[PDB]
Design a protein around this ligand. Structure first.
Ligand SMILES: OC[C@H]1O[C@@H](O[C@H]2[C@H](O)[C@@H](O)[C@@H](O)O[C@@H]2CO)[C@H](O)[C@@H](O)[C@@H]1O
Ligand SMILES: OC[C@H]1O[C@@H](O[C@H]2[C@H](O)[C@@H](O)[C@H](O)O[C@@H]2CO)[C@H](O)[C@@H](O)[C@@H]1O
Ligand SMILES: OC[C@H]1O[C@@H](O)[C@H](O)[C@@H](O)[C@@H]1O
Length: 358
């Protein structure tokens, strides 16, 4: 609609991903592939605040973006992921985090938010777009029978609400994570999802800064598939555009003219999964459609790269306390390192298989 957060701004490139990509490119032995790989650092991505250790990094990004805007004549936009809930990743094992409910988890989380707000407050000339807590709300829609999720429900809702309420006070544009077509896009899940997202939006005061929802984060779905991926059998909403087209009117009828962003960073190669629920380090994935506000849909503000391709989805080591057997399936690249850490061989394949090519 009228106010697309990306209009009129230059996106500040992630220095964190740039550091990973530059080091990765120097280890890619074929020169042509290496130069393609290095160019990935010039593609805008979201930087994840997956621990309190990343908050000072945010400060450096905001200050660097502010200075760059001054010296290039532009207004700069910093893209972040808020990803540190207590009892994080409640329906899987791979991305358990540093906060736990019993260890002052909710209070520590809200202070994590306070530290982030305190950084953002110092740089009002820099726009921030934040994806709020990948997987969390989607787990509350469909996984309430998972006892870790059920026992985390009040903490998740309180923490997400605190993030939305307080990031809005410093003008952060926000997209709540909303799973993907194979998670919440099933027709049967659309209304339960809309009802929960509506309640969350209402609880945070319907802030104009809460733009809508993010989809496909860290997943592999097409935005628009000419033919359904065979894994989608039984779900007419076989790609993200079908999911968004079906969900958005429900939000509108609840009063929220929500818009969307869609991760395509690992979506260049379709039809490569055995089963739709295979989310971990899918082999043969390629970088997908480059970020753009030319989205092909009234509901979609931007195609984005949220998950930084090359950072692992999870370890394949069953000796790890974060081992999830999804990461050992036949379509998962193995051996794979701990979630979030660099997976060089996987990055090289993402480069080689990029569609459109790099
Ligand atoms: O999409 C990335 C996240 O997937 C989560 O699992 C989902 C899965 O994507 C769906 O396809 C379906 O199988 O339901 C699952 C939830 O039970 C996973 O838990 C997360 O760790 C991933 O980040
Ligand atoms: O489950 C009831 C639901 O089925 C829908 O059709 C299914 C069909 O049963 C299945 O064989 C096929 O693989 O997927 C389609 C959906 O894409 C039917 O359209 C619904 O009316 C019905 O509620
Ligand atoms: O790579 C982006 C994010 O992916 C998640 O799966 C990891 O748990 C995070 O540590 C990381 O920040």
């Amino acid at each position: 609609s009228a106010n697309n957060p990306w209009t009129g701004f230059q996106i500040f490139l992630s220095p964190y991903y740039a550091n990973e990509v530059a080091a990765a490119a120097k280890q890619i032995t074929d020169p042509t592939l290496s130069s393609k790989a290095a160019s990935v650092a010039n593609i805008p991505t979201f930087t994840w605040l997956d621990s309190v250790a990343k908050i000072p990094d945010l400060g450096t990004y905001l200050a660097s973006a502010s200075a760059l805007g001054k010296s290039t004549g532009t207004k700069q936009l910093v893209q972040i992921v808020i990803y540190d809930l207590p009892d994080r990743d409640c329906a899987a094992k791979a991305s358990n985090g540093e906060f736990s409910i019993a260890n002052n988890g909710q209070a520590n989380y809200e202070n994590y938010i306070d530290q982030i707000v305190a950084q953002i407050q110092q740089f009002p000339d820099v726009r921030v777009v934040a994806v709020i807590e990948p997987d969390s709300l989607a787990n509350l829609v469909t996984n309430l029978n998972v006892q870790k999720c059920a026992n985390a429900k009040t903490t998740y809702l309180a923490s997400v609400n605190y993030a939305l309420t307080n990031l809005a006070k410093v003008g952060v544009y926000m997209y709540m994570d909303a799973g993907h077509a194979g998670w919440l896009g099933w027709p049967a899940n659309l209304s339960p999802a809309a009802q929960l997202f509506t309640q969350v939006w209402q609880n945070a005061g319907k802030s104009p800064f809460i733009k809508g929802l993010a989809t496909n984060v860290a997943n592999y779905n097409a935005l628009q598939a000419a033919s359904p991926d065979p894994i989608t059998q039984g779900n007419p909403n076989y790609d993200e555009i079908h999911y968004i087209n079906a969900l958005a009117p429900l939000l509108q009828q609840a009063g929220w003219d929500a818009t969307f962003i869609v991760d395509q960073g690992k979506s260049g190669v379709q039809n490569i999964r055995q089963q739709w629920g295979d989310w971990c380090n899918i082999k043969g994935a390629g970088f997908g459609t480059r970020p753009t506000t030319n989205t092909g849909s009234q509901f979609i503000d931007s195609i984005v790269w949220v998950k930084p391709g090359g950072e692992s989805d999870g370890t394949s080591n069953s000796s790890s306390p974060r081992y999830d057997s999804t990461c050992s399936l036949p379509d998962a690249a193995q051996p794979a390192p701990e979630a979030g850490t660099w997976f060089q061989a996987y990055f090289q394949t993402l480069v080689s298989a990029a569609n459109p090519p790099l």
